Symmetry: C2
């Protein structure tokens, strides 16, 4: 295949430059890399590759990838190709992918607008095949720049895969029957649509409220606070799906079931031996809802209470009341108050200054191997 | 099918009924009913250790202590362990039972590096002990939460043999230069079990040595990088003993050295998802220190152990001990910050997250091998 020849050429160069990450911004390296890219019989003739070669050859005087990002942001085609350095996506160096876009609801894209691209990866180099790489952000390029209107990509096929591997088995085992009826047996296109709604609502709400990111990002990287921010925007997404009447009723309920099931189940067991950021926040949600009448435990199984929408509003309101005090107190004091809220509903070890999976989800992890 | 399998069936069934009652595990109303159920169990209730627990549980309201059970266990009246457990890092354990077999020990090792350590294989056990998380059992894991300096500490060597077979061997083949661990190459389970038992005996002994031993300084060594650094301090101490103590059999000591080194350099280095755990942070500190100070070399992504590695290991231990020695003239909090500074020089510490990332070398190995 012609695209398969291109990607085979990318993987071979990637293999040659692995172990050269310390010189990814050194011009002698970039000059050589650019030359090998230009001479690749198939890769080198791609328009996106013309752009990268140009950016790299000019990097000594202009350290950014403007021609590459212009191509990508303008969607000149559906190929992405660049040199990457994202510490949380370590598999990414020289990488290539082709994507396909997904259907989009007009009201959703208009009322909750953001430069979000929910896409499926069709083909890709080796670095993009890691299960860790679920998205691609503009600062992940070696230049490290992000602008408000740079496109952000979410690889929806990977979230479908995660839903079918973890969430479904968790729904069967942990939820009371009838908890997520639209999700039962739903095909991959159905899950795809719901996941695409989730990422659009997610990125939009990151920018809303009194401590939005990127502005307050450096105050929201502590494990419990990073998770809480992810939870804040997804609870907002859930409530949008429940409350905004201009969204199609069937797709809106489906997306609500998706976001809630992901936040309640899949995210709640992430991380070994300790919960990661998302899991701490999901365990905060679990215990908050239990204590405030939004869910109930019957026979080791979770029942969703009819009052759940009101308890979700209560929970988001609570987060927003803490964040609102940024106007009258320091960011550090809000941090302490968000931490104090989290620790009331999670298993925090004050000597380790870290968290343990609450027993409910520790048992589930043991039972299901998740 | 087995009298022990009948006993365990009773424990497992009693375990199931009291799951969901952990908050009542010290409530005397619960304890009377648990004790009564244990006493009335047809096979379990006959056991001396079960009579000891019933006695302990019935008196808990006035003496919250499992003295009779622990006396039985610490005196090795038989090879059975049975108690009610509450260990936050071993969440599978509630009412549990196991039978063990001890392992042979080198006499010089056991005398010169003495500690109340019991390297054992689990023969049969209740469900809680079957979790791969449960690799050991400490005295404070019982509901009474007490540990005495001479309480026996158990390590389940069969699970460490399992982990070495499933992870370490695969990492040796893929990551080390050939010839790196010649004695461990194709060693049978009996051989690995022997080295592992040496590892745990030296490990527990050295925990108690130095200027900031545990348990005395335990609450200063629970932060992730410091907890890992303390595991690494005692295991490097163990490596050096195997290389330097001439009264240990040479063949067995080198095998044990290979085992401790391979475990710390490889298996522990990849622990934790998405971030390294305590052990992995310290193991990556060791990797980078050794790389930068001439103890190992990387050639095309494969590790070569330098002949100078004994001297670099001594230098590394000497450096930890220089930092810890200042406990005598500064606060434990000041020593903590210097241990952190030392660690962060050689690990990938994200200062905004206040946590660590797997260094790229081991991040790629996790991706490649699924470890
Ligand atoms: Fe996010
Ligand atoms: Fe230890």
């Amino acid at each position: 295949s012609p695209t398969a020849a291109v990607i085979a050429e990318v993987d071979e160069l990637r293999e040659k430059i692995k172990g050269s990450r310390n010189s990814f911004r050194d011009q002698s390296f970039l000059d050589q890399l650019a030359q090998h890219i230009a001479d690749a019989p198939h890769l080198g003739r791609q328009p996106i590759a013309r752009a990268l070669v140009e950016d790299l050859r000019g990097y000594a005087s202009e350290p950014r990838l403007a021609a590459v990002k212009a191509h990508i942001n303008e969607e000149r085609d559906q190929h992405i190709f660049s040199l990457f350095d994202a510490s949380y996506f370590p598999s990414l160096s020289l990488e290539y992918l082709t994507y396909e876009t997904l259907p989009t609801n007009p009201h959703l894209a208009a009322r909750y607008a953001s430069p979000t691209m929910p896409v499926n990866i069709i083909a890709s180099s080796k670095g993009f095949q890691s299960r860790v790489v679920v998205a691609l952000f503009p600062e992940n390029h070696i230049d490290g720049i992000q602008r408000g209107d740079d496109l952000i990509f979410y690889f929806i096929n990977k979230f479908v895969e995660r839903h079918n591997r973890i969430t479904r088995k968790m729904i069967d085992a942990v939820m009371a029957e009838g908890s997520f009826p639209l999700l039962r047996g739903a095909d991959d296109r159905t899950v795809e649509q719901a996941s695409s709604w989730w990422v659009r609502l997610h990125e939009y709400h990151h920018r809303q409220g009194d401590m939005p990111i990127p502005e307050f990002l450096r105050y929201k990287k502590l494990k419990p606070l990073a998770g809480l921010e992810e939870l804040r925007v997804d609870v907002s997404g859930m409530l949008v799906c429940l409350n905004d009447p201009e969204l199609p009723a069937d797709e809106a309920r489906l997306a609500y079931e998706y976001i809630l099931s992901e936040r309640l189940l899949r995210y709640a067991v992430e991380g070994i031996p300790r919960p990661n950021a998302d899991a701490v926040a999901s365990q905060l949600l679990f215990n908050y809802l239990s204590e405030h009448g939004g869910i109930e435990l019957h026979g080791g199984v979770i029942r969703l209470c009819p009052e759940l929408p009101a308890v979700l509003t209560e929970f988001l309101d609570r987060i927003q009341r803490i964040e609102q005090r940024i106007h009258t107190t320091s960011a550090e004091e809000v941090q302490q108050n968000l931490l104090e809220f989290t620790n009331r509903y999670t298993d925090y070890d004050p000597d380790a200054k870290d968290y343990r999976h609450i027993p409910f989800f520790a048992e589930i992890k043991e039972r299901l191997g998740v």
